[PDB]
Design an enzyme around this catalytic site. Sequence first.
Site, PDB file in Angstrom:
ATOM      1  N   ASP A 110      -0.633   2.096  -7.554  1.00  0.00           N
ATOM      2  CA  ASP A 110       0.593   1.764  -6.817  1.00  0.00           C
ATOM      3  C   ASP A 110       1.645   1.130  -7.755  1.00  0.00           C
ATOM      4  OD1 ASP A 110      -1.475   2.215  -4.940  1.00  0.00           O
ATOM      5  OD2 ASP A 110      -0.548   0.932  -3.441  1.00  0.00           O
ATOM      6  N   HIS A 131      -4.641   5.303   9.465  1.00  0.00           N
ATOM      7  CA  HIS A 131      -3.587   6.210   9.938  1.00  0.00           C
ATOM      8  C   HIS A 131      -2.178   5.814   9.399  1.00  0.00           C
ATOM      9  CE1 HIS A 131      -6.795   7.457  12.615  1.00  0.00           C
ATOM     10  NE2 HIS A 131      -6.106   8.572  12.870  1.00  0.00           N
ATOM     11  N   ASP A 157       0.874  -1.167   0.000  1.00  0.00           N
ATOM     12  CA  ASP A 157       0.000   0.000   0.000  1.00  0.00           C
ATOM     13  C   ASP A 157       0.917   1.224   0.000  1.00  0.00           C
ATOM     14  OD1 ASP A 157      -2.379   1.674   0.165  1.00  0.00           O
ATOM     15  OD2 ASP A 157      -1.692   2.081   2.205  1.00  0.00           O
TER      16      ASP A 157
END
Lengths: 180, 146
Positions: free
Chosen positions: B81, B124, B11
């Site tokens: 990505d 987060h 990610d």
Amino acid sequence: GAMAQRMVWVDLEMTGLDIEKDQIIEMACLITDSDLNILAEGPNLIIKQPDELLDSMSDWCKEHHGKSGLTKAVKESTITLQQAEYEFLSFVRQQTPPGLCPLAGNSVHEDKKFLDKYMPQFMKHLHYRIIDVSTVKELCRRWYPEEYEFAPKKAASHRALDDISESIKELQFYRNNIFK
Amino acid sequence: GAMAQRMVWVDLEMTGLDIEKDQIIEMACLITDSDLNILAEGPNLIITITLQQAEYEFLSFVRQQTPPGLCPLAGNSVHEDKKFLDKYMPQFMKHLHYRIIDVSTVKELCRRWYPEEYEFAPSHRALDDISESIKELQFYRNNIFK
């Protein structure tokens, strides 16, 4: 079903994998409904590119585009990139509402890379979503090895429109055999 | 064939979507087996470290977990990505297979073909985003696959 639930299948053939140097030499488009029922075949266009580019292709690229008969058709082409984008964009506007339908294909991330750079207006007609048959292929091979073995082998390359047909057939096989 | 069926999950967070102008802010990577069991968690880097060192950290990690050229890149909307990775981390991408496993394809098939399962389907840090994408994929295996 609703026109907003339609899928926009594309297959592109290019001179190579380098987004800075390589160019699009063939493109095809096909529309299916949400359930992979065939709605309308779009253009199958062979796009003109220079001879220098066609000779600087990889040895794998040189032979595979030669036996399919593409390199010959690229050299005799009067279709420019701009003319092809106009044809593909016009077709998808007649078939789908704006920015709501996904791009669909096999390893279609590679095609999107070239469409994002060289056919950006066509890409603005499509939603952000992607349906990639190859993600389903990888999960079938792992989770359903017995069903993966029975799937048909892919046919020899002819034109981009026949490649889309094989991609649709492949995802229909997955729906028919490994989905609940 | 169990080793070739492992998956390289990543990610990334970027400054935008333009490959020529935007850059990689954050990256995480981890390896699962073919059945989605997490075999090893990699680093969650904020790019603080440099891109070329981040590539050495990630390439060292995937070289000791998967065989070269056999395992695919896996993630959620991993097409964007993969674009940034092919450019800014080409030695890492040389270790992976050409195909990718994108959870967003499965979500979309769930949405169309399984509208009921889709309604009850389930960051987060970038490593936490990978963990949630695996749980999303496991949900689809259990609820829409045969």
